[PDB]
């Protein structure tokens, strides 16, 4: 059950200066990067082209190249059209892609945020505002929905291209997507707060508890999942104890990579 996300972020500082950058995720693995500095989209995996032929990829990249330049000018023009309602600086974020279910089933999305707030989506055959969006956006929506060529292309990208492409990615990237990487744990303490560190695990699902023999210590506070640079995860679980109870305590870690052979580290 995998979600493919094209994330685009653009900053317009004033009428002349702007940049647009994007990254592409399949689950929690990065498949593409497109810096403003680059003329071309870059593969961040060997399998990032999926099952597309070179001609199909070339065509798709060209469409995106035309898009980035057109997008940039369109925002600038939409600002002029609405002035003095909205002024620079402006931040636009797009999140677009498809969620893949089993069989032939999927659902696509294209969501747009303005100054950090979700305001616009493409849905069905057209652009629309969503609940909470300001009314001044009805003019931009009307102008965007006038562009029949863009609407046909977006409908094709969302309905057909995205799911077809992603089915090929899942096939091509199978051995990276199904990789198992083992956690390594280590212990420490501060003012007493005991910390169980867990690092290098893939995939994300992991179980970490402070223990006394068989007794799960329900004081255990799990932190957030944090990324490492090598596409593995980091997590730590903290506990509150009185100075004297440290002996007997262990950190137990369960994870799919270990084949039922849990990591037990005693203080």
């Amino acid at each position, epitope marked *: 059950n995998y979600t493919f996300r094209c994330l685009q972020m653009s900053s317009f500082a004033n009428r002349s200066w702007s940049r647009t950058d994007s990254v592409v995720w399949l689950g929690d693995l990065q498949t593409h990067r497109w810096s403003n500095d680059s003329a071309t989209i870059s593969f961040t995996k060997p399998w990032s082209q999926g099952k597309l032929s070179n001609q199909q990829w070339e065509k798709l990249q060209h469409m995106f190249q035309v898009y980035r330049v*057109s997008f940039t000018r369109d925002i600038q023009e*939409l600002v*002029k059209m609405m*002035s003095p309602k909205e002024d620079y600086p402006i931040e636009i974020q797009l999140s677009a892609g498809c969620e893949m279910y089993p069989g032939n089933a999927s659902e696509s999305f294209l969501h747009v945020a303005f100054q950090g707030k979700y305001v616009v989506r493409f849905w069905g055959t057209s652009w629309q505002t969503v609940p909470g969006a300001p009314s001044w956006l009805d003019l931009p929506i009307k*102008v965007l929905n*006038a562009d029949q*060529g863009t609407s046909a292309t977006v409908q094709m990208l969302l309905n057909d291209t995205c799911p077809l492409f992603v089915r090929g990615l899942l096939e091509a990237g199978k051995s990276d997507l199904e990789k198992q990487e083992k956690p390594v744990a280590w212990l420490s303490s501060v003012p007493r707060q005991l910390v169980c560190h867990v690092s290098g695990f893939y995939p994300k699902p992991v179980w970490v508890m402070w223990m006394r023999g068989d007794q799960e210590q329900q004081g255990t506070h799990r932190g957030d999942f944090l990324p490492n640079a090598d596409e593995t995860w980091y997590l730590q679980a903290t506990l509150d104890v009185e100075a004297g109870e440290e002996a007997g305590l262990a950190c137990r870690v369960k994870h799919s990579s270990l084949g039922g052979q849990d990591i037990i580290l005693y203080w």
Partner: T-cell receptor
Amino acid sequence: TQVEQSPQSLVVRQGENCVLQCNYSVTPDNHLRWFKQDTGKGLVSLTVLVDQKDKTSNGRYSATLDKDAKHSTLHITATLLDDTATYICVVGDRGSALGRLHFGAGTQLIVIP
Amino acid sequence: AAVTQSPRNKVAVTGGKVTLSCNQTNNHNNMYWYRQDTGHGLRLIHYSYGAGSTEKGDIPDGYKASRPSQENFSLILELATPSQTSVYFCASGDEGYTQYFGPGTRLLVLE
């Protein structure tokens, strides 16, 4: 100049057919319009072409568009004296008011009656 | 969808003030001014997305624009020069790509 027309000018005799060309580098290329402009007058739209491979007609005017080649041809069949005019090619870079129009400098047709 | 221009023809002197007016009762938000010179396609000078909006085109220099209402869009030449001798075209449109052109205005700026 992103829009180029050929020939610059041509002289034909009444009843003859003629072929006018438009070549452009405009990107993107949403649509292409042909205007007729009589001397001292304004711009009368003859046709607009919108698809990747398109063909239009309007009486004795017919035209083609090939977006891969960035090329359009205007055909005038059976010329009359009143076809004497400048013919202008225009490419729109968006399918909305956000577009800019890129105008060719025109082809002058004279039809000898 | 019609557009009108006044005056239709104008002789002026270098250093004079010339105003070219465009009127449009289509309730179009958008209006555009161009000049046409031989050997060139029409070139965009100024445009406007509604009352109070004025924006620079490709060749704005020597021209101010004014959009006092939805109906009227003016091109103002405060210090006219011989190089501003041309045929000027105004157009309007709604959210669609079609620009509806006026009949043109001929300007001669004599020394």
